[PDB]
Amino acid sequence: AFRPISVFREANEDESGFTCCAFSARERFLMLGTCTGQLKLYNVFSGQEEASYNCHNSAITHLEPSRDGSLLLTSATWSQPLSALWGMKSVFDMKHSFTEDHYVEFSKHSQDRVIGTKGDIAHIYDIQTGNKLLTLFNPDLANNYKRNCATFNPTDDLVLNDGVLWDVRSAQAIHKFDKFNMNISGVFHPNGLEVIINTEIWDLRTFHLLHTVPALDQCRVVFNHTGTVMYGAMLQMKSPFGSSFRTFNATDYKPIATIDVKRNIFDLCTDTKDCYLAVIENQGNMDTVCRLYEV
Ligand SMILES: NC(=O)C[C@H](NC(=O)c1c[nH]nc1-c1ccccc1F)c1cccc(Cl)c1
């Protein structure tokens, strides 16, 4: 089951403004973005704030720490810059910013690059210099996914942007996947063999359709660290998700559990050891709690 372990809200605040979360390198410490553009570091078990940092002048939508715990990507709503890279080492300082990119991820095998999305366009930046290396967009192959998010594959040699597979080295589109929905652009399976674009599961080798999984419709998807479980929550208030998330066996895409928290979800994340699941849920207008579950 998902046994509730603990709950906490943003300390002191009349209205709790948690918008997103990620587990840090440090065990029992969660990072949370707020609707006022702050990064908070919380003890997940005590529910006590340890540290607060000013990142953006608008709501944090999404964040991602680097595996080495040295770097953090943030994205905001109406700020400029919209996304940024932060040093989490000595002083908490902005390394680089990414202009109009509303979503950013690290590269996967080696975290030496950032991939940002602006609408249908993907930008690849170098972490050290912060120089835009590549702009990926082909007007001939675009799907114009409303909620497009560009992503590297596990080995960083491919990118999926707007349902288009790109060879990173040659910067050539090598395959466009057919469009079946208006919103969701898809992710790589951590096994490196499959891409998941909404309900469709494509083989990377043959580009054949392996499965249809209707339950994934309009879902953002995140895998547990071992790549054994896939979490999905249907997109929709400022609330990006409805009231439920679903788990699937990542090996065979069979359903496991449907969890309905009866409250709108802003975000979820699992820790490095996949013991715990953190969910940001609205109680109400904006009064979010972080709920911690034992997986
Ligand atoms: N940290 C993660 O990548 C987790 C991921 N978060 C988002 O996708 C998310 C949280 N706010 N806005 C978003 C979001 C919404 C739409 C498009 C891109 C986005 F990043 C997720 C995946 C599966 C279920 C859920 Cl409940 C969340």
Single-letter amino acid code for the residue at 209:
L
Distance 267 CA to ligand 1 centre (A): 6
Protein residue with its CA nearest to atom 17 in ligand 1? 147
CATH at 41? 2.130.10.10
Which residues in the chain are immediately followed by a break of C to N over 2.5 Å?
A: 236, 284
Q: What's the rounded Cα separation, in Å, for the pair 100 and 92?
A: 22
Of 222, 245, 269, residue with least CA distance to 29: 269
Distance 62 CA to ligand 1 centre (A): 7
Question: Taking a C-beta distance cutoff of 8 angstroms, is the pair 32, 280 a contact?
Answer: yes
Tokens of 119: 């609408």
> What strand order describes the sheet that includes 255-260?
219-223, 229-234, 244-249, 255-260
For residue 162 and ligand 1, the question of a CB distance below 6 A is answered with no
Q: What b/e sequence results for 269-295 when a residue is b if at least 16 CB atoms lie within 10 Å of its CB, and e otherwise?
A: bbbeeeebbbbbbbeeebbbbbbbbee
Protein residue with its CA nearest to atom 7 in ligand 1? 267
For residue 61 and ligand 1, the question of a CB distance below 6 A is answered with yes
For residue 261 and ligand 1, the question of a CB distance below 6 A is answered with no
Question: Taking a C-beta distance cutoff of 8 angstroms, is the pair 51, 45 a contact?
Answer: no
> What strand order describes the sheet that includes 288-294?
3-8, 288-294, 276-282, 265-270
Tokens of 175: 């395959």
How are beta strands 151-152 and 132-136 bridged, if at all?
A: unpaired
Of 29, 12, 31, residue with least CA distance to 21: 31
Of 256, 229, 246, 245, residue with least CA distance to 281: 245
Question: Taking a C-beta distance cutoff of 8 angstroms, is the pair 105, 112 a contact?
Answer: no
For residue 269 and ligand 1, the question of a CB distance below 6 A is answered with yes
For residue 62 and ligand 1, the question of a CB distance below 6 A is answered with yes
Question: Taking a C-beta distance cutoff of 8 angstroms, is the pair 62, 103 a contact?
Answer: yes
Tokens of 97: 């910013």
Cα angle: 116, vertex 25, 13; to 5 degrees: 80
Q: For 108, left (φ over 0), alpha (ψ -120 to 50), or beta?
A: alpha
Residue matched to tokens 């709108």: 264
CA 276 to each of CA 1, 16, 42, 266, 293: distance values in angstroms, whole numbers, following the listed order: 12, 22, 15, 17, 6
Question: Taking a C-beta distance cutoff of 8 angstroms, is the pair 96, 119 a contact?
Answer: no
CA gyration radius, the chain: 18
Q: What's the rounded Cα separation, in Å, for the pair 197 and 218?
A: 10
Atom of ligand 1 nearest to the CA of 21: 1
> What strand order describes the sheet that includes 103-106?
103-106, 113-118, 121-126, 132-136
User: 248: domain range?
Assistant: 3-294
Number of C-alpha atoms within 13 angstroms, CB side, residue 118?
12
Which of 31, 35, 61, 62 is the best mutation target for the ligand 1 pocket, counting ligand atoms within 8 Å of the beta carbon and taking the most? Answer: 62
Of 52, 50, 71, 63, residue with least CA distance to 20: 63
Task: Kindly tell me the burial class for residue 47, based on how many C-beta atoms sit within 10 Å of its own C-beta (0-12, 13-18, 19 or more).
Answer: middle
Q: Three-state SS across the chain? A: CCEEEEEECCCCCCCCCEEEEEECCCCCEEEEEECCCEEEEEECCCCCEEEEEECCCCCEEEEEECCCCCEEEEEECCCCCCEEEEEECCCEEEEEECCCCCEEEECCCCCCEEEEEECCEEEEEECCCCCEEEEECCCCCCCCCCCCCCEECCCCCEEEECCEEEECCCCEEEEECCCCCCCCCCEECCCCCEEEECCEEEECCCCCEEEECHHHCCEEEEECCCCCEEEEEEECCCCCECCEEEEEECCCCCEEEEEECCCCEEEEEECCCCCEEEEEEECCCCCEEEEEEEC
Atom of ligand 1 nearest to the CA of 241: 26
Virtual torsion, Cα 278, 248, 104, 156, nearest 10 deg: 130
Give the count of beta carbons closer than 10 Å to the beta carbon of residue 24: 18
Q: How far apart are the first and last CA of the chain?
A: 7
Which of 82, 108, 220 is the best mutation target for the ligand 1 pocket, counting ligand atoms within 8 Å of the beta carbon and taking the most? Answer: 220
**Tally of domains within the chain:** 1
Q: What's the rounded Cα separation, in Å, for the pair 139 and 50?
A: 47
Question: Taking a C-beta distance cutoff of 8 angstroms, is the pair 169, 205 a contact?
Answer: no
Question: Taking a C-beta distance cutoff of 8 angstroms, is the pair 223, 230 a contact?
Answer: yes
